[PDB]
Design an enzyme around this catalytic site. Structure first.
Site, PDB file in Angstrom:
ATOM      1  N   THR A 182       1.601   7.879   9.224  1.00 48.60           N
ATOM      2  CA  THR A 182       0.485   8.131   8.323  1.00 48.60           C
ATOM      3  C   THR A 182      -0.702   7.233   8.663  1.00 48.60           C
ATOM      4  O   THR A 182      -0.532   6.050   8.955  1.00 48.60           O
ATOM      5  CB  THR A 182       0.901   7.879   6.863  1.00 48.60           C
TER       6      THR A 182
HETATM    7 CL   LIG Z   1       1.293   6.167  11.898  1.00 53.77          CL
END
Ligand SMILES: [Cl-]
Ligand SMILES: [Cl-]
Lengths: 310, 313
Positions: free
Chosen positions: B141
């Site tokens: 992320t």
């Molecule tokens: Cl990442």
């Protein structure tokens, strides 16, 4: 003991569909009560109410849901348990008769924990379909409810077919945590057990995370004023919806501590609700309407009552 | 004037991909500032930073995302604008090179006005892919928060989600209030705040962390406000009581006009580590840092928090 409040068809007042809504809201409440009197969990009770609400061909949820741009059905539904605080949801789901059943299934599986990875609480599209089928959920060939049991445990669920002709893949509030429904048992920072379910313009309910907002406001002394303030300040007059020419939404609320205060409010022309106590026999239905001269999407309507369980 | 803060890997520490994370973070900030120096909106600035982050084959977002249970890539991403307060997101999206691009476009289109009906702010699966292609987004992320010289903030996040996840599993990067938040100062909030999160999707969702951090940052002391949230509203959140270790990270920025703009920025995580990058338009020098938990501290049980101050314009 046990109480249940449900909603269907929030929006413009239909001097025809009204009778149909009352009918299904009646039996949705009946099924929920049956479940509770059979010692079922609050989540199975609220789920049974939703299945009944979804199955009515007149409700925009489950069978009879609005067709999207491609003439296809895509459903959103979610459910939350106040005791475990767990949640289950599906978005853009097709091929399943009762979306709320997939959400409730995801919730129960979620309550089992890593018994070998953190379980999914939100599945969408084809993956949600395969997951449902893989768990035995009947593959075919906005409504909602809030419940509280004799122990004071609360649960909430919401199911919708979303907007007619919507672009494929468009997901609304019925699938989003904090927006479509909410259920939270009494706690250190939660003097009251509260359950909430919403309806109306998906985007409006999402931007204001209405369901959760109502639950928080309801921690105050005056439930009636708490809801009114939220619908007015946190919804109609929300800066997040300032660019909107009219804010459309409806919500049903349940608060207990057994003293159960139940209310419904909406900015839509009308909304049908049905409520019942396990020691009440026969559900009561009611078409809530905005006061005369009140403009839909610009004003609020709020009604409710109290009930004492045993 | 302008400031950007980014992150690209809140999770296990790895002295071998750490240089890789810093490298892409530095570039992301540069693209964000470059966009801002060119007179672009705060939203285009955060999008450009995320585009750069996604393209890194070492990040779990866009190119190089974790393969799901079927061996395919499905991505989640969202973006929010503090000025208009509009939002855009995509869930379980595959076949698109930069998922954040689709989220940004959804937001831009929404800002234009009603289609008849409010435009859609959240699309998933095939429908999301179709909408993307029909709007000129190239087929095939991490996060960021930005503030422009005028004080408008924006935020975004992009992720490949849990490794070997069941198809269609949507996490925090796609959910409103959970993955990111951006809100300019207003009648009730004296500070313009922006937040982007990372870590265990489910923990971030159940606690609606991005929004929770933003509301906490309205308090007089930002450092203390954020710590209390990460401890009381995350690690010790009743909603996560059944969890053994709450994993997640967040980067935040808060600004208030003084003419100068006072920007306080911080990052916090319960994961072993998290790489971040930040840069001021004026300084013209992007900086990177690998945040690590204190020795002895336990991942999922402890909280690391760092930050600084920056005056713009
Ligand atoms: Cl990442
Ligand atoms: Cl309906």
């Amino acid at each position: 003991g046990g109480f249940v409040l449900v909603h269907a068809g929030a929006g413009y007042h239909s001097e025809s569909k009204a009778k149909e809504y009352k009918h299904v809201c009646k039996r949705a409440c009946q099924k929920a009560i049956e479940k509770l009197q059979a010692g079922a969990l609050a989540t199975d009770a609220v789920t049974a109410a939703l299945v009944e609400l979804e199955d009515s061909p007149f409700t925009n949820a489950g069978m009879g849901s609005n067709l999207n741009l491609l003439g296809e059905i895509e459903c959103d539904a979610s459910i939350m348990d106040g005791k475990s605080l767990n949640f289950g949801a599906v978005g853009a789901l097709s091929g399943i008769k009762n979306p709320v059943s997939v959400a409730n299934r995801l919730l129960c599986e979620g309550q089992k924990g890593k018994l070998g990875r953190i379980p999914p609480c939100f599945l969408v599209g084809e993956g949600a379909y395969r997951w449902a089928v893989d768990h035995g959920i009947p593959s075919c060939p906005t409504v909602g409810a809030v419940v509280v049991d004799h122990e004071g445990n609360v649960a909430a669920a919401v199911s919708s077919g979303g907007l007619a002709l919507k672009h494929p893949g468009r997901v609304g509030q019925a699938a989003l945590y904090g927006c479509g429904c909410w259920a939270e048992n009494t706690g250190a920072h939660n003097p009251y057990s509260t359950a909430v379910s919403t309806s109306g313009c998906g985007e409006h309910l999402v931007r204001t995370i209405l369901a959760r907002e109502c639950s928080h406001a309801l921690q105050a002394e005056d439930a009636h004023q708490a809801l009114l303030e939220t619908m007015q300040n946190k919804f109609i007059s929300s800066p997040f919806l300032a660019s909107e020419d009219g804010v459309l939404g409806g919500v049903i609320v349940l608060r207990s501590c057994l003293l159960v205060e139940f209310l419904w409010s909406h900015t839509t022309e009308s909304m049908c609700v049905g409520y019942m106590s396990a020691q009440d026999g026969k559900a009561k239905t009611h078409i809530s309407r905005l006061p005369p001269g009140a403009v839909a999407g610009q004003s609020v309507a709020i009604e409710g009552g109290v009930c004492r369980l045993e």
